[PDB]
Every structure is written in C-alpha cells, then in structure tokens.
Amino acid sequence: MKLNISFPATGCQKLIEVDDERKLRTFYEKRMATEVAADALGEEWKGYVVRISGGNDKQG
Amino acid sequence: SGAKFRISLGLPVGAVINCADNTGAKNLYIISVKGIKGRLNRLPAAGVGDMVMATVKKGKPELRKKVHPAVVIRQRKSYRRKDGVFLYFEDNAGVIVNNKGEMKGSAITGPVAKECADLWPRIASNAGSIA
Amino acid sequence: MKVELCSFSGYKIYPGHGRRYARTDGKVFQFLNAKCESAFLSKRNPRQINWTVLYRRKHKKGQASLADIMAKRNQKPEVRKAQREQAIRAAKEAKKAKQA
RNA sequence: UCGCACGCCCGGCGGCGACGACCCAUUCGAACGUCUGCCCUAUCAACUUUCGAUGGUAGUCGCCGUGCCUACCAUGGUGACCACGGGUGACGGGGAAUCAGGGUUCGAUUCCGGAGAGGGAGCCUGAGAAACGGCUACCACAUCCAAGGAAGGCAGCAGGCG
RNA sequence: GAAACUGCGAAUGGCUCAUUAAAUCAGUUAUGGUUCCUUUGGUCGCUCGUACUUGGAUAACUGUGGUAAUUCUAGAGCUAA
RNA sequence: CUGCUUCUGGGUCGGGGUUUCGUACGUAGCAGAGCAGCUGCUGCGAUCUAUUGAAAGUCAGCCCUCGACACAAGGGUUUGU
RNA sequence: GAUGAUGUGUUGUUGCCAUGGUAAUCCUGCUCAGUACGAGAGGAACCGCAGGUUCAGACAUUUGGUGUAUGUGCUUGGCUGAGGAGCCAAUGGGGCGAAGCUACCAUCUGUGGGAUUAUGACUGAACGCCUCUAAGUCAGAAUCCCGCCCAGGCGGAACGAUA
RNA sequence: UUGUGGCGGCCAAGCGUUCAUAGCGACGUCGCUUUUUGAUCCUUCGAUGUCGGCUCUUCCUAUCAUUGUGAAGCAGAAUUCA
RNA sequence: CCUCUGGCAUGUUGGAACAAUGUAGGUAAGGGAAGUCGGCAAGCCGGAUCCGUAACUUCGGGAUAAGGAUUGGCUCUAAGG
Ligand SMILES: Nc1nc2c(ncn2[C@@H]2O[C@H](COP(=O)(O)OP(=O)(O)O)[C@@H](O)[C@H]2O)c(=O)[nH]1
Ligand SMILES: [Mg+2]
Ligand SMILES: [Mg+2]
Ligand SMILES: [Mg+2]
Ligand SMILES: [Mg+2]
Ligand SMILES: [Mg+2]
Ligand SMILES: [Mg+2]
Ligand SMILES: [Mg+2]
Ligand SMILES: [Mg+2]
Ligand SMILES: [Mg+2]
Ligand SMILES: [Mg+2]
Ligand SMILES: [Mg+2]
Ligand SMILES: [Mg+2]
Ligand SMILES: [Mg+2]
Ligand SMILES: [Mg+2]
Ligand SMILES: [Mg+2]
Ligand SMILES: [Mg+2]
Ligand SMILES: [Mg+2]
Ligand SMILES: [Mg+2]
Ligand SMILES: [Mg+2]
Ligand SMILES: [Mg+2]
Ligand SMILES: [Mg+2]
Ligand SMILES: [Mg+2]
Ligand SMILES: [Mg+2]
Ligand SMILES: [Mg+2]
Ligand SMILES: [Mg+2]
Ligand SMILES: [Mg+2]
Ligand SMILES: [Mg+2]
Ligand SMILES: [Mg+2]
Ligand SMILES: [Mg+2]
Ligand SMILES: [Mg+2]
Ligand SMILES: [Mg+2]
Ligand SMILES: [Mg+2]
Ligand SMILES: [Mg+2]
Ligand SMILES: [Mg+2]
Ligand SMILES: [Mg+2]
C-alpha cells in the first residue's frame, strides 16, 4: 500500500511504500478528509498531523 | 487444489428449480445427482455447486423430453460457509452445463454462490455477481 | 473478522451469529436473528418499529526568489510614493513631450 | 468586455467599430387546428364508457386551445352514406409504365412532408432532441480481461458473412 | 503560436422505409390559441434610489501517481475571463 | 448424582446481572379525519406524540447475592472379625 | 434395559481383568504427470496434500424445528355496569419467543500391533546338475487374533472406618 | 430322490491369422447343489394363518466392487481367466 | 361459540409422577407424492361484495366453472319513511 505524501506549505511531494498494518490502522475506519495524527507511524514521524485526501483502489 | 467443503443440501430428486440462463429453458426437474451412492430409501439430494442431472419441464420445445446435466446455482436451504455465515438465497436456481463444465447458455441471471463459482470456473465467468 | 451491521434492525452482527440473505438481484442482506428476518421478509419499515436503530435516529432519542519578494513586500510606503514621484518624472515630462 | 487608427479643449470631451443583452418587430420555422380526399374484407353488424367514451363547470400541467389530466355532474358519441374489427408482399404525395375515349397497374428510390436508428422506455444540456457518429436502465445479441471490471449500436461511405 | 478554459455548432446533412389506413400526406384556411437561438430593424442617462475597474475559484503547466485495461483520471501546488 | 451449624450451611423472599416481547395504566398535548352544545370556548373522537428500549415475565433444571426472614446439633430400622 | 442375590465379618473408597461384544468404510480433486508406456491416439502408479459418500459415537455455541415458561404483544365472539384489569371458546387464533429436547437441517471425533493366507523368494538336498521344501529361512493382506473402545465372573487385590 | 433347472470337472476334435488348452471347447463322459420345477405322500385335516411389498437381524460363497496376488492374444488405459 | 332462568359435580374411584408404546390433537426448515397397489390419511380452497366465466349440451344447464380484487377500527356524507 503506497502513500503519496505531500508538503503543501512550499508545495513538494514524493511517494513512499509500507507493508504492515499496525503502522496503518492510524488511517483505517475514518472518513475521507479527517484529521489524523501521523505520530504513530515511525521513527521520523513525530509532530506531524496530516490530511488523508483519498486515493486509488487496488484496481485504480 | 482445495476441494469443495460440505454444505447442507436441500434439493432432493424431484425438485423443479429456476433454469436461470439464456437458453430458453425455464425449469429444471432434478432426476438424479451425480456422485451420490446413497443408502436404502435415501433421496439423492443436491446443494449449491453440485452438478446434477435434470429434465426441462417448461420452456422451449427442443429442450424438453431429454436429459440435460445441470449445475445448481442457488438454493434457499441455508448452508453454512466455513467462516461462520448461514447464507441462503431467494429462490432455487440452476444452469445447463455439459459434461466438461462449459455452459450451454451464454449468460446467467442473478447471483451465483461462491461455493459453485470456485468449483466451476466457467459458470463463474458468465456470472454477473458472485455470492 | 468483520463485525457487520444488521439490515433490518441495525445492531452489530458478530462473526458466529446471524444469517445471510441474497435475493435474485444481488442485494446481500445480513440479519442478526430471526426476529429481524421475519420482520424484513414481511416487508415492515424499520422506521415504525420501536426497538431498532433506524427508528431511534428518526425520532432522535438518546444522545523571483522569496528574498526579493519579501524585500519588495516589506518596503515602506514613503519610498513607494517617491517611486510614484519618479514615475511622475517620467510621465508628466513625457506628456509635455506628447504635446511638444 | 475587447480591438484599431488618435484628435480637440486649460484633467475633460471625443472617432470607427467588435461582443453581449430585457422587450416588440421581421426571417427560418415548428406546433397543434378547419374543410375535402385512400386499397381489401360482412367467413367483422353493432362499437365506444366510470380503465374518459361524448359533453358542462372549476382547477392541474403545458409554450399555448383542448377530457390532456384530476374532481363533480349530465348519458352521451359513431354506424347500412359500411361504424368498429381484421388484412395490406401498404410511408403518403410530386409522379412512372401502358395507352383511341375511358381506364388498369406501379410509386422503397435522389424533390416536399413523416417516421426510426437492434426493441421498448426515461432524461441532461440546448432556442431547437424524447437526440441515439448523447446519456441512463431493462430485453436480445456481442468485444477485451489478471475475473476485480470496462466499453458498444453501419436502416452514414467503402467493405464482410448471411 | 502548439495546449487549455469560454462562446458556437454537433437537432442541418446522409441512410432506410419497419410502423402507421382520416393516421401520415396532399390542396386549403387559421394561430384574435402558442414559442421561436439566429440574421436584419426598432428600443438600450425615460426609474430618482472601489465606479480610475470590486471578489475568489478553475484549466493549461510543474510535480507525485494509481489501474491488467478506457478518450479512466486521484492528491498537491501557480494562474486569466 | 447431591446437600444438611468452622459465625457456618442451605432454603424462601427481595435485589441486581442475563434475556424474551415491544414502548404499560394514568396524565399531558393548539397532534387527530371530524362531530355536537355555548359564542373564540367547552364536550365526544379510532389513532399518534411525550413520560417510556417503557411495562410485564425470567428457574421452577439460568448467574452472582452476603439485604431481610425463619430453619438447621434431630427422627426411625438393622449390621461384630 | 432395571432392582437384587452368594460370601469376602459389616460397610465405604480406589481399582485389576477372567470373560463376552467390537468398526470403520469406499471414493473424488491437486500433485506426481500430459511424465513412464506408445508410431500415434491416449495415458496411469507409489509417497504426500485437500475434501467427500455410507457407518458409528456424541453434542447444542451457532442455523433450523418445536414451544402451554400458556413468557410477551396484536386480535374475533361473548362475559364481569364502563375504564382499568381480566376470564371463557376441550390449547380461541396468530406474530415473535427464553430454557430444555432436537436435526448430516448446525458442529466435533473415529486408532495401533502379532502369527500368517494367496503369492513372490533364500540356502538346500532328494535325483552328480536343478528345485521356494523335504529339514531350515524371508517379505506378506480389506482376512484371523489382539490392541483402542463397551459391559465387568457364585473372580480376586489394596486401603480406610469399624457401634 | 435329482429327472428337469443351476453350477463344475475329465479327454481333446476344432475356434483363436500361427498355435488343442491366453480365452474357448464338438462328439462323449464324471460329478456337485437344493435359490427352479417335477416325483413321492412320511409329518400336519379337534386348522402350523395360504402371494407380494415394507421393516429388521443373521448366515453362505458359487465374488460385482474394494485389499493382496498369480496369468493373458497384459505396451499404458481398459478388460478377460484364476 | 359465550351468557341469563333452570340444572349439574365431569358421568362405576382418588393421589403422585410426565419413561417407552399407544389413542386423540397440533407444528415443522429445504424439496413437494420421490412414499405407497392407489395422494390412504392429512393438507389446500372456504363467508360476503364487486368483477369474470370456457369446451360441451337434451338450450334447462355446466356454474360458486375456472381466474382476480376488496374485507378491520373510527369519523362523516348521501339516499331509502
Ligand atoms: N521437460 C521438457 N519439456 C519440454 C522441453 N521442450 C518441450 N517440452 C515439452 O514437450 C511437450 C510437447 O511440446 P510441443 O511443442 O507442444 O509439441 P510439438 O508441437 O509437437 O513440438 C510440451 O509439454 C513441452 O512442455 C524441454 O526442454 N524440457
Ligand atoms: Mg424403498
Ligand atoms: Mg404492415
Ligand atoms: Mg410496410
Ligand atoms: Mg414514395
Ligand atoms: Mg419494401
Ligand atoms: Mg428521430
Ligand atoms: Mg442492423
Ligand atoms: Mg434515443
Ligand atoms: Mg452510426
Ligand atoms: Mg444523426
Ligand atoms: Mg455519399
Ligand atoms: Mg476380549
Ligand atoms: Mg503426448
Ligand atoms: Mg517418447
Ligand atoms: Mg439454539
Ligand atoms: Mg425458534
Ligand atoms: Mg429453541
Ligand atoms: Mg379493557
Ligand atoms: Mg361444548
Ligand atoms: Mg414459530
Ligand atoms: Mg507382519
Ligand atoms: Mg510356501
Ligand atoms: Mg515372516
Ligand atoms: Mg486352426
Ligand atoms: Mg400320508
Ligand atoms: Mg404360530
Ligand atoms: Mg473361495
Ligand atoms: Mg375428564
Ligand atoms: Mg369424580
Ligand atoms: Mg415441511
Ligand atoms: Mg416451508
Ligand atoms: Mg417405490
Ligand atoms: Mg411411486
Ligand atoms: Mg381423502
Ligand atoms: Mg366443469
């Protein structure tokens, strides 16, 4: 499951990939465009709160 | 590879079920099930996925008075999936299928259960929605 | 496990329980128990039956770099009106040249 | 709102236009209306109606008039002058062939009007569509596939089977 | 001046004759019973109550992509009428 | 197959827990097709809304009680290497 | 199927096994493998793996049945003046229904050894060589017997308490 | 009791392209069986309830399948005989 | 079917249990005569109102043929002396 992260304060982006779900239920069972905290993601992810903005399914 | 688990059968010999395909046949009277040994005074019954032998009781003229192998598609006896759901369907159903699995029809009306769609892979391709 | 919701009532169906229904047109409806199943197959609206969830939500019960951009941005307006004045030093002399 | 030439009063006046508009005209029309006109069949003689049939009143809807629809009343409307029903190997017409005078047959076919895009149905935009070289379903047929889905409509020009 | 937004056209044309027997269609009149983009010609300071030019989105584009596949398009970032 | 005075034990009742059915009687309501008697009011009115997932039943073969109430050191018959 | 009997002094606990009964069955799919074999066409097996038929033993979480908890609502005719609360109609009828029973109509589980039969062989004479047999020897099976499992003997044992 | 019915031997003319016996087997001949029918009338006429089917247990083997095997005109697959 | 007047004590006995097998009622998922000689028994339909009604025929029938819809409670209105 890929994650297209994007910095809108200056306006850049790139793509990352992760393949485990106890790092990813921070996103699950929400709406689209709610506010979730990315502080439960990993080593570099402290203090980052984030918008999930929707994306493509397994079939795109 | 993985074989077909046991599901509760509720279509004995002598059941008319909906012939739900685009041949023109509208009934299937079950005459005998394929693969059934049975004991003394045991009706050979069929469930979902059980390829059966039937006779068209109502429909086109050139599909009656002749035995067709068929495949049960839907039953309304509530069978038990292994993950713990007692699924059943609105009506009983079946399509007409030769001895190699390929359908005499070209399309299937309504849903085909997964217990038949995994076992007969050419009934699954003509199926609009699965289970 | 997927802990799904009952179609007639709207309670929370746990994995072992319940019963699944599938009509001829798709529409796979779950059910918690036969009390709900009989009331669905009798075609009863949940909005009229006091013990479900779709009743109680109806009746509402419960509850140019950035340095240069900022450098010209922060500029003090008497310098701006002096720049307006050398724009006048261009324009009014040029319009005297227009008539001249 | 936009473009080209650019002048005149001691900032203000100005030229030729281009575009866009409420409403009335005019044009292209469309749309229901009036009168008259059609082949075969009586082995079709009564049909039409509370499922609007023919009227009256008041509304709905429509772009308008209107049983077009709704409510309430009236019991009507058509027919031996062929109603109603069935058939058409029937789109109608300008016309075509044959012909003394009469006629009889043909008119799918390039001009006008109509209907239809596989069969019915429903709609979006638009002044104009119930459009199909637009969309949404169902029915029938049918293309790709990783099986989760996607897209289509030659009775347009060629061309292919049948 | 590619690209893209906006306006307009795509309801004309072309094909076929399945349906339809007062229906279509033909001569005829009406619309004082209705609409009508367009083109032309009228109206366009007739009202008595920041204007030296008001606002904020969006496309192209840069960038990151997903789907087996479509004239599928997603999140971000600039910008006009 | 069990139980029958270590301030302990079972038993009844009560209480909760669980659960089944589906929202009690009364009361209120300018909610109620309407109707009647007085000049806007008062009565009749199936049903609805609120109180109200209310009311009612729930071990007799459901689960915990440590609340109340009484009971419980007994009766009878036989058995000796 | 159910009491019980004899004696073991009386009783109780824990047991032993003499004996009888006995049970599991067959198939399909994946793989082996489009391989061995065969000019082809066709086309298997052994070990594994996943399931199923018939059978036996259970069991109630879940699904279904039942349902007079006559539990709770709705309701017809009547009856208690009416409401309320209820009753009768041989269970008034109908929903929905707890507990308990219950269903391949839900779910779980179903075993390992020994001597060997048929047969294939070893050494090896009879009968100079040969020979699976004559003395001796090996493999050997849905059979047989035992195990596992059910009952527990006019069958025992250990151990406690013994007015 | 075993004609008749059923089942199985022996001998080997011939079938099996070749080849008696893989599988068969003429003319003859020897037996077994009481799931056929006859034959007899011993038992039962002071009554043994006289066809089938359903249900249910047990037994035989002259084996259809399954286990293990030997043989083929058994290459595999199928199938015959034991 | 329920009640009033009148009549009676459940029809030649009681109590405690709710095992098998009965007799008499019922109910059943999925299938619907596959059971059996045979749809035996059970089940289905059922009253009324508004529709609709075929073959055949001795013209009388068939005929409630078959096949549909509605039915409660409450509040009105109209018509029938
Ligand atoms: N094991 C193996 N099989 C092969 C090889 N080459 C071909 N095959 C197999 O041969 C089989 C038949 O081959 P195919 O081309 O279809 O037959 P052909 O068309 O007559 O040559 C196929 O199943 C192939 O997989 C090889 O190099 N090794
Ligand atoms: Mg039978
Ligand atoms: Mg026609
Ligand atoms: Mg025609
Ligand atoms: Mg023409
Ligand atoms: Mg034609
Ligand atoms: Mg058209
Ligand atoms: Mg075509
Ligand atoms: Mg269209
Ligand atoms: Mg086209
Ligand atoms: Mg067109
Ligand atoms: Mg052309
Ligand atoms: Mg033993
Ligand atoms: Mg090959
Ligand atoms: Mg080879
Ligand atoms: Mg249960
Ligand atoms: Mg139940
Ligand atoms: Mg139950
Ligand atoms: Mg009451
Ligand atoms: Mg009585
Ligand atoms: Mg029930
Ligand atoms: Mg051994
Ligand atoms: Mg030997
Ligand atoms: Mg040995
Ligand atoms: Mg020869
Ligand atoms: Mg005698
Ligand atoms: Mg006797
Ligand atoms: Mg033998
Ligand atoms: Mg009695
Ligand atoms: Mg008495
Ligand atoms: Mg049933
Ligand atoms: Mg049923
Ligand atoms: Mg039978
Ligand atoms: Mg039968
Ligand atoms: Mg009967
Ligand atoms: Mg009749």
Name subunits touching C (3+ CB pairs < 8 A). B
CB-based contacts of B61, cutoff 8 Å, min separation 6: none
Burial class of residue B127 (count of CB atoms within 10 Å of its CB; 0-12, 13-18, 19+)? buried
- Rounded Cα gap, residues B1 and C42, in angstroms: 42
What is the resolution of the experimental data for this entry, in Å? 3.4
Which candidate in B74, B76, B80, B86 is best for mutational testing of the C interface (most C CBs within 10 A)? B86
Structure-token pair, residue B80: 């038990």
Collapsing DSSP states into helix, strand and coil, what is residue C91?
helix
Distance C91 CA to ligand 32 centre (A): 99
- The owner of tokens 């004991």 is B39
Cα separation of the two ends of chain C: 91
Q: B124 φ, ψ to 5°? A: -70, -35
The number of residues making up chain B comes to 131
Q: B71 φ, ψ to 5°? A: -140, 125
Buried b (16+ CB within 10 A) or exposed e, C60-72: eeeeeeeeeeeee
- Rounded Cα gap, residues B80 and B92, in angstroms: 16
**Cα–Cα distance list, A8 to A13, A16, A56 (Å):** 8, 17, 20
DSSP C70-81: HHHHT--HHHHH
Helix (H) or strand (E) holding C84: helix C77-99
- Rounded Cα gap, residues C91 and B71, in angstroms: 93
Collapsing DSSP states into helix, strand and coil, what is residue B117?
helix
Which one-letter amino acid corresponds to residue B105?
Answer: G
Asked if strand D comes closer than 7 Å to B67 Cβ, the answer is: no
Q: Tell me how the structure was determined.
A: cryo-EM
Cβ contact A19:A2 at 8 Å: no
Report the residue of chain C nearest B88, measured CA to CA: C21
DSSP C4-55: EE-SSS--EE-SSS-EEEEETTEEEEEESSHHHHHHHHTT--GGG-TTSHHH
CB-based contacts of C44, cutoff 8 Å, min separation 6: C8
